[PDB]
Amino acid sequence: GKSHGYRSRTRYMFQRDFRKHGAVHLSTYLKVYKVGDIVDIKANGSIQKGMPHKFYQGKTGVVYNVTKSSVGVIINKMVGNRYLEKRLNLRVEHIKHSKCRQEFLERVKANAAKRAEAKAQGVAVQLKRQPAQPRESRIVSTEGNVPQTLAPVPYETFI
Amino acid sequence: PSRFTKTRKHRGHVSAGKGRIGKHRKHPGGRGMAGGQHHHRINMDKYHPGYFGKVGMRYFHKQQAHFWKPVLNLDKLWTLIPEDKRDQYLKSASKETAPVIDTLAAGYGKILGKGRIPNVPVIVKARFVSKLAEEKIRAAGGVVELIA
């Protein structure tokens, strides 16, 4: 018979990192989680309790609840033709603050700051991110750089 | 009427509406409620939970309307008094010429406490009232007369 236990196919997913087995460092237990925090889910197979099912490995979601030893996390999950709402009880050992949100908050703090120093000058801001643009015209010089000119190479076995 | 019927629209298309692969055969899946616990189980749970098995006490030779006790809420109550006669009693608001309402005569069998009535005294005669219904009457200057 086929075999579809709970931790199937997770031989390498829940392995520890090479030369990173053993006690989980204290940092992990000192990070504080509030509701509305966006957490990254990544199981640690030494902490067997509060484990995320293998689906949620690699998935980010928001804390809806905070408890003695675990956060509750909301995950949107597609089944069939629609996302369903999913509530996960994960111990903190399997959870991490999502850096991408910190890029965002820090940018929001930037964009309020930029906006001030412009009304304090009544000038214009230009606050939206622009994407990487073409390139403007340049004049490269030949001073100390007369173009070495290359040509294709003969065939030659080295074995 | 048949003139508006779909089967009129279908004439000349083979197989009526019923298909080519799957036919319209003579009772696939069984007659009536067959296989409720089996192949017709997914529909029976959901859409009809509770369908199977017993529950509660049996009662031989039960006679409905041994339990005839229709309800009335204060929520109305004043409907029992004839319209034109009502205005009169509404303002008179007296404990001395208070109107009498024979609810059992109206066809009811228990007064229940839903809603509010105005501060006007009413003599309410009935069998059975709710602890709250008589509380409101009593607080509007009326009383409850138990009858049969």
Binding site: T142, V146, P147 | -
Partner: protein, 51 residues
């Protein structure tokens, strides 16, 4: 009712964009370029004709 294309029929060419009248008048669909004797540096031609 009928699309007319200014790339023919001057009338609708002039309906849109009046400046065409003058454009034509001053030619300048030709118009000679200026003139400059700026010659190319030695290294430019050395490399060009290089092997």
């Amino acid at each position: 009712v009928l699309k007319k294309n200014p790339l023919k029929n001057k009338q609708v060419l002039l309906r849109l964009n009046p400046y065409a009248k003058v454009f034509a008048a001053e030619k300048l669909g030709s118009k000679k370029a200026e003139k400059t004797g700026t010659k190319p540096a030695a290294v430019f031609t050395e490399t060009l004709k290089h092997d």
